[PDB]
Design an enzyme around this catalytic site. Structure first.
Site, PDB file in Angstrom:
ATOM      1  N   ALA A   1      -0.668   0.916   6.114  1.00 52.60           N
ATOM      2  CA  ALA A   1      -0.913   0.034   7.251  1.00 52.60           C
ATOM      3  C   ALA A   1      -1.969  -1.028   6.917  1.00 52.60           C
ATOM      4  O   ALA A   1      -2.772  -0.876   5.983  1.00 52.60           O
ATOM      5  CB  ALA A   1      -1.346   0.863   8.463  1.00 52.60           C
ATOM      6  N   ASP A   2      -1.968  -2.106   7.686  1.00 49.40           N
ATOM      7  CA  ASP A   2      -2.909  -3.192   7.462  1.00 49.40           C
ATOM      8  C   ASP A   2      -3.119  -3.906   8.784  1.00 49.40           C
ATOM      9  O   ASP A   2      -2.189  -4.053   9.577  1.00 49.40           O
ATOM     10  CB  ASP A   2      -2.349  -4.180   6.436  1.00 49.40           C
ATOM     11  CG  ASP A   2      -3.397  -5.146   5.923  1.00 49.40           C
ATOM     12  OD1 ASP A   2      -4.275  -4.715   5.149  1.00 49.40           O
ATOM     13  OD2 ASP A   2      -3.344  -6.337   6.294  1.00 49.40           O
ATOM     14  N   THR A   3      -4.338  -4.376   9.009  1.00 49.46           N
ATOM     15  CA  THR A   3      -4.644  -5.056  10.248  1.00 49.46           C
ATOM     16  C   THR A   3      -5.324  -6.380   9.970  1.00 49.46           C
ATOM     17  O   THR A   3      -6.202  -6.468   9.108  1.00 49.46           O
ATOM     18  CB  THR A   3      -5.568  -4.186  11.150  1.00 49.46           C
ATOM     19  OG1 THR A   3      -4.897  -2.971  11.504  1.00 49.46           O
ATOM     20  CG2 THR A   3      -5.922  -4.927  12.441  1.00 49.46           C
TER      21      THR A   3
ATOM     22  N   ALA B   1       0.308  -3.938  11.003  1.00 51.54           N
ATOM     23  CA  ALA B   1       1.619  -3.594  10.481  1.00 51.54           C
ATOM     24  C   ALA B   1       1.563  -2.179   9.943  1.00 51.54           C
ATOM     25  O   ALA B   1       0.519  -1.720   9.462  1.00 51.54           O
ATOM     26  CB  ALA B   1       2.012  -4.538   9.352  1.00 51.54           C
TER      27      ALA B   1
ATOM     28  N   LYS C   1       0.831  -1.197   0.000  1.00 55.26           N
ATOM     29  CA  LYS C   1       0.000   0.000   0.000  1.00 55.26           C
ATOM     30  C   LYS C   1       0.876   1.261   0.000  1.00 55.26           C
ATOM     31  O   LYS C   1       0.635   2.192  -0.768  1.00 55.26           O
ATOM     32  CB  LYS C   1      -0.902   0.046   1.237  1.00 55.26           C
ATOM     33  CG  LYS C   1      -2.001  -1.003   1.299  1.00 55.26           C
ATOM     34  CD  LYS C   1      -2.774  -0.877   2.611  1.00 55.26           C
ATOM     35  CE  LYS C   1      -3.631  -2.103   2.865  1.00 55.26           C
ATOM     36  NZ  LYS C   1      -4.359  -2.010   4.167  1.00 55.26           N
TER      37      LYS C   1
END
Ligand SMILES: OC[C@H]1O[C@@](CO)(O[C@H]2O[C@H](CO)[C@@H](O)[C@H](O)[C@H]2O)[C@@H](O)[C@@H]1O
Lengths: 185, 185
Positions: free
Chosen positions: B69-71, B106, B53
């Site tokens: 970011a990613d969850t 992250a 991203k």
């Protein structure tokens, strides 16, 4: 818990520099393809190379923190590799004579929960050199070992007029930035 | 010279979390077709998604500092996505009921001279949920657009017994760690 530290480089200069941190570590290296991408800038390429060297070792030691590094000597967008023949080392030195070049060192730190890569650039200015100095230096066999055909330490020191940046980064490892990065690991 | 800050995310929670840093920044919307690769651990995948991203935007704006970011919500190695059906929501909530699961977020920060990626893991424990509670909560339509079929804010807050980690990371962005990383940019 904490993680063991690994330096993925056999460079003597990088060892003496990382030893300044007084943090135990081992030296482990796994050879990787080092052919640079024609479409990458030198800044992209040097970071990519440090990243690859660190990752190859991180793949073998996933619970560790692995430091990879790479240094390039670049003149007018063109970078100089290690000389194959003495006349090439001589050709490089003649090119560096009397002007400035850039020394770019990238560092990549890899762990399973955190990775960080950066480059540090230093401007290095050379005095005008003469053939005698160039060949005398070449005879020492010091140039035949580094990118651009010279080392800022030892006899190459006499060639340097000044630098704008980090002397340690020119030796191969920006130690203060590396130490600062490690605090967050 | 400094660099402008860009958030590569359409998440409202991430926008409101980044606002706490009181740093000026812009948001850039990007279409990124990124998928998990079955040969990665949740820890490797979430970091890879956050990096993709950020990179998709950084490639277009190389002079900036881009944050991606990613969850992921994971239960025993298996990670849950959003339920495309209410019966699935009830299925996920039942799995999550009366036990603990991991929320892994992250963050990747990209710039031409520096990049950094890390994940932050938080243990989230749920109260034993009842069919009434579960279904009544789904009828609110809140768990239908959320990974794991719940949100730590809103009515879902009533399901959480406790967490061991970072509440902001569960929301989508470990803000204190992000602020700390940005200091080195
Ligand atoms: O979601 C819009 C976002 O997508 C991008 C590509 O990441 O552009 C796409 O959407 C545009 C707006 O509808 C189109 O004009 C474009 O052709 C399409 O690629 C981003 O540029 C935009 O921010």
């Amino acid at each position: 818990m904490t993680k063991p530290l690994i330096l993925a480089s056999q460079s003597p200069r990088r060892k003496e520099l990382l030893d300044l941190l007084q943090l135990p570590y081992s030296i482990i290296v796994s050879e990787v393809e080092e052919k640079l991408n024609r479409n990458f800038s030198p800044e992209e390429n040097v970071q990519w190379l440090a990243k690859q060297k660190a990752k190859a070792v991180a793949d073998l030691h996933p619970h560790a923190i692995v430091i990879g590094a790479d240094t390039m000597v670049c003149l007018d967008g063109e970078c100089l590799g290690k000389p194959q023949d003495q006349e090439e080392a001589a050709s490089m030195l003649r090119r560096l004579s009397g002007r400035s070049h850039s020394v770019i060192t990238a560092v990549s730190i890899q762990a399973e929960n955190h990775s960080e890569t950066f480059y540090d650039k230093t401007e290095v200015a050379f005095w005008s050199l003469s053939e005698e100095e160039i060949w005398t230096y070449i005879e020492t066999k010091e140039p035949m070992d580094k990118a651009g055909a010279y080392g800022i330490q030892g006899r190459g020191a006499l060639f340097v007029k000044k630098i704008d940046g980090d002397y340690y980064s020119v030796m191969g490892l920006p130690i203060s930035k590396t130490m600062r990065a490690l605090r967050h690991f």
